Design a protein around this ligand. Structure first.
Ligand SMILES: Nc1ncnc2c1ncn2[C@@H]1O[C@H](COP(=O)(O)OP(=O)(O)NP(=O)(O)O)[C@@H](O)[C@H]1O
Ligand SMILES: Nc1ncnc2c1ncn2[C@@H]1O[C@H](COP(=O)(O)OP(=O)(O)NP(=O)(O)O)[C@@H](O)[C@H]1O
Ligand SMILES: [NH3+][C@@H](Cc1ccc2[nH]c3ccccc3c(=O)c2c1)C(=O)O
Ligand SMILES: [Mg+2]
Ligand SMILES: [Mg+2]
Ligand SMILES: [Mg+2]
Ligand SMILES: [Mg+2]
Ligand SMILES: [Mg+2]
Lengths: 274, 263
């Protein structure tokens, strides 16, 4: 038939269940509602089994594990892991071209008149990369994993999310080829070797190369552009990429929403505890 | 006798991780000679350390400390959790952090109803209680993450380790002291003092506060679960272990990287 679960039913099923409910079709409302009742019980049973398993076998958190898996792969390739402050300045945002008129500006959480929660890692990474160039003539390769914040409103969007951002200044070889190779290192280390690279428009970067899995963006990457590099006193080929770690984990683990695999007081590693 | 001047101490600590406050000199000329030499050594040592990190990169020192402690706690039966940085005003109020408490004035507000967490306890206690709804046995969990406080060994953003144990125990104080030992040994700081609630100090500097039975976290229930917990400042632990001359060098920064100044 053509009858689907209602939007409310889909939300109720996804609360405790990680099935693919949006695909189901039914002949009529009675059959839809009977199937909903059955699948709500399955979802709750499966959820409880997962919680009992985590209690019986304590483990590192799934998001922490993914971070460690990727970070170890990048260190093995000669990337320095950095940690930078969550607070950044209004000026730092302006140097990314994120000023009052831009849409991303409206998504920023301000702490005071001059400081904000970072919505991206690039401002701090540009700073650190430029300073590291003072200490070497070779490539400068760094990465950070940490929380970024944006006002949002819900598909694959969190207000606090974990970005992995990498930067490579002065790469040996063509900057685009080098960028594609480091994307490959990350994706394989994350357990997601199958993905598409797709050119997309960008307010900040003009054009990005995005990593998409079945049409879902999990990363944006860019070489420069020159104006952005020069705004950070960078005067050589440069590239970087930013990955959404909860998005990666959600896709790999087949969680039905993006809210289950990261930080939460309701979910733990895909299962709802309350 | 003369010591390094206050300005000389600050200048030496900018690039250097020596212990400069103890040095004594016979006269200004010898102080100034020693200062010039120690400044030069600190700067060259710093440059070499940065060149070594570029040449042979490693996991960040703070990330490594988190992993070392986390490994040890999971081996002891603790579940790792991650909770949001944002918490509600009501959650703080249930913490007893109300408009009158001095910590309240240290809170970074995001809007009228939400703040950056100044500690991990409110979220950790909530998660422990919910996990206890799913088992008959005790629940032991930990989190490591950023907390935020307006401040004057203090950082505005710092990394807390918080661990908790809820449910049937038996000699809760000795069990809590053992969890402290597990963390401190895994961090590479086996020598410390317990002080009085229990505080952990190294040479007089607080690095952890711990408690049995903080039933104030649970005003919503008449009957409480037994519980204990402990909170550690990870930058403080790393600074002490690595002998960095300030607390600003081992954690998150755009001027320091693993103890060394990059600008
Ligand atoms: N609110 C969010 N929640 C979770 N992940 C996010 C969020 N915003 C961005 N990301 C991730 O961070 C990566 C780099 O950020 P960025 O390129 O600025 O995202 P974006 O273009 O705003 N993505 P989108 O909002 O889906 O169109 C993205 O590719 C996502 O994987
Ligand atoms: N601003 C800060 N910067 C770094 N570490 C901190 C900070 N505040 C607290 N900590 C650490 O977090 C642990 C638990 O927090 P808490 O018990 O609230 O600290 P506290 O009593 O305010 N300590 P203090 O401010 O040194 O007197 C402390 O023992 C410290 O190791
Ligand atoms: N568009 C997303 C993802 C993205 C794209 C290109 C980037 N290029 C860089 C170059 C140098 C240093 C850091 C970066 C950086 O993080 C970066 C991040 C965002 O920024 O949120
Ligand atoms: Mg967006
Ligand atoms: Mg996009
Ligand atoms: Mg994008
Ligand atoms: Mg204090
Ligand atoms: Mg204290």
């Amino acid at each position: 038939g053509t009858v689907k679960y209602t939007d409310a039913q889909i939300q109720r099923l996804r609360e405790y269940g990680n099935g693919t409910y949006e695909q189901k079709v039914f002949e009529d409302l009675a059959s839809r509602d009977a199937a909903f009742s059955k699948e709500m019980s399955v979802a709750s049973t499966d959820n409880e089994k997962k919680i009992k398993g985590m209690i019986a076998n304590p483990s590192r958190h799934g998001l922490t594990q993914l971070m460690n898996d990727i970070a170890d792969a990048l260190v093995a390739e000669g990337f320095i892991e950095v940690r930078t402050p969550i607070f950044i300045s209004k000026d730092a945002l302006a140097r990314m071209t994120i000023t009052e008129d831009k849409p991303l500006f409206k998504q920023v959480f301000w702490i005071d008149e001059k400081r904000a929660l970072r919505p991206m890692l690039a401002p701090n990474l540009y700073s650190v990369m430029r300073d590291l160039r003072d200490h070497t003539d070779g490539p400068v390769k760094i990465f950070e994993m940490g929380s970024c914040f944006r006002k949002e409103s819900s598909g694959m969007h969190l207000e606090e999310f974990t970005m992995l951002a990498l930067g490579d200044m002065g790469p040996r070889g063509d900057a685009t080829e080098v960028l594609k190779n480091y994307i490959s290192v990350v994706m394989k280390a994350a357990g997601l070797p199958d993905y598409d690279l797709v050119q997309e428009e960008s307010d900040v970067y003009k054009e990005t190369i995005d990593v998409e899995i079945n049409g879902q963006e999990v990363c944006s990457a860019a070489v420069g552009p020159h104006y952005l590099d020069a705004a950070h006193d960078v005067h050589e080929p440069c590239s970087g990429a930013g990955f959404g770690l909860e998005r990666l984990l959600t896709i790999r683990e087949k969680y039905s929403t993006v809210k289950k695999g990261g930080a939460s007081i309701s979910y733990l590693n895909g299962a709802k505890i309350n």
